[PDB]
Amino acid sequence: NPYFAAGGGLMILGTGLAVARSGIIKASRVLYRQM
Amino acid sequence: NPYFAAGGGLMILGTGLAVARSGIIKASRVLYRQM
Predict the structure, then answer these.
(1) What else is known (chains A, B)?
(2) Choosing a second label site near A18 at 20 to 30 A (CA), which of A8, B4, B18, B22?
(3) Cα–Cα dist B5/B1, whole Å
């Protein structure tokens, strides 16, 4: 295993945070202020 | 645990202060100069 791949875990955590933010903002845009 | 992965906490701090800044600027632009 690589010995300095801890940044890669932070990279995928950041992508997860980004897609979660996109999901929640789309959900709020489509349900609470649109439905 | 790999201690270089502890920078993910600073990632959380950054994304918390960013949304806090967004919330306070929205609140200032809706309460004082709008309401």
Answers:
(1) Present with 1990 molecules/cell in log phase SD medium.
(2) B4
(3) 8
